[PDB]
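Q: How do we represent a protein-ligand complex in a form that can be generated token by token?
A: Start from the inputs.
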Amino acid sequence: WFFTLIIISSYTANLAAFLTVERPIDSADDLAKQTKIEYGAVEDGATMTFFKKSKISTYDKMWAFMSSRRQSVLVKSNEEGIQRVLTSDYAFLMESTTIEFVTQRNCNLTQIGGLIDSKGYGVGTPMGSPYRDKITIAILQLQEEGKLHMMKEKWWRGNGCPEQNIGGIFIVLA
Amino acid sequence: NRSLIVTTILEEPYVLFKKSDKPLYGNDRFEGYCIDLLRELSTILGFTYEIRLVEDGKYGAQDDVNGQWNGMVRELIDHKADLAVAPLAITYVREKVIDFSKPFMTLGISILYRKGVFSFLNPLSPDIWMYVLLA
Amino acid sequence: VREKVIDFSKPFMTLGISILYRKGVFSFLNPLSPDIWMYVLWWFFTLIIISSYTANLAAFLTVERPIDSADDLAKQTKIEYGAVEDGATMTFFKKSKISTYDKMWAFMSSRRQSVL
Amino acid sequence: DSADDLAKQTKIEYGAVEDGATMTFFKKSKISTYDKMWAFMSSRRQSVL
Ligand SMILES: N[C@@H](CCC(=O)O)C(=O)O
Ligand SMILES: N[C@@H](CCC(=O)O)C(=O)O
Ligand SMILES: N[C@@H](CCC(=O)O)C(=O)O
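Then emit the structure tokens for the protein with glutamic acid bound:
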């Protein structure tokens, strides 16, 4: 009796530690403070340049990491970055629009945290081009008429990806 | 009038090569959101155009030691393209050297990453379940 | 920073920055799931269950998922915090070299559109 | 398993050859793990270098 008393006490105590401990990347800060999970960005794009120029401590620390490890963690395309997330312990700094497309099609992937910054995509022109203001007005017309939203839905069609123990003792009973 | 030269870059779902069995030529090779945008702009503004992939495969950044740009941004600086129609971010450093329309889409940088009855046999080791039965 | 660019009278009021904040039998039905209470409704079987309930309840009493200072806010992110944009309190945090306050500034700056 | 695991603790001491390249790597590094390690090694230098 004293023997079984100790055992059942041990089982209970031990089972508690596994439940106590049972009770996680959520932000850039979480990446910046570690190195086991590598991270990076598209070389020679805007995301890279944001980190390269930033004076914000979290982002400056991330740039120092990406610069150090750049032959491995800076990639030449979003496609390459995605393949690194899928095939290694790697988080990819990517624009949110593109993340929305990727996560609707790769259901094992997700966006971590929110937006780090805010920017737009625009049609580029040489400095001084007369087309710049004409394209602005055309874009505003397309937005207001609903055509840009229709185009996003079209190219953004990803109707996919969502956004015990005690039992074992029952079977041995029956 | 002269067709405008439009620089772009492959990036799904903005700009892609169309799938087909017959070979495709010229502008007919491409599809995507930015291709549909370009088609709409061309109809509203009354221009024709020729799509060309940026030869270096880059969006564009400035070299820190020699100060030269690359990518689509450099194509515009050098007047080798009339327009860049692509998911091209409007940024401080770029707006000092090229011009941009107001945005057709808004976004931000974020992070892409990943998301047993044997939990009953673990607490008390298999070796222990055995001995407790032998005893 | 302001006295370097404008000129102030001596004070009419003295003050400092501080923090403004706010001041179930179902915790018994949680440890052992409603689904489990059902199925449970033989000695070795009940032994395991009561042991599980005890162990699990202990976990609950340990973690159990009190703010007294800026240090307590700085160490966490569940409770957000901020300040008036473009005022003296914001600028105090923005300029501070003191570890607690520099950590708070990093948080406020990150989340500025929501917390300033 | 890693430098990160050493950096996060102080029970196990760590160090390097004084006035060599490894020491200088830590002394110069901006990478958080390695800068934390340098602070430890510098503090405890008479014993760990
Ligand atoms: N859209 C970016 C490239 C992708 C990125 O930097 O995340 C650019 O205009 O440079
Ligand atoms: N009284 C402050 C504004 C309020 C604050 O910063 O808390 C000032 O002079 O800027
Ligand atoms: N080989 C090193 C010395 C040994 C070390 O620093 O680990 C040097 O050239 O400084």
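The radius of gyration of chain A is 25 Å. The interface with chain C takes residues 8, 11-16, 18-20, 22-23, 29, 56-58, 165-166, 169-170, 172-173 of chain A (CB under 8 Å).
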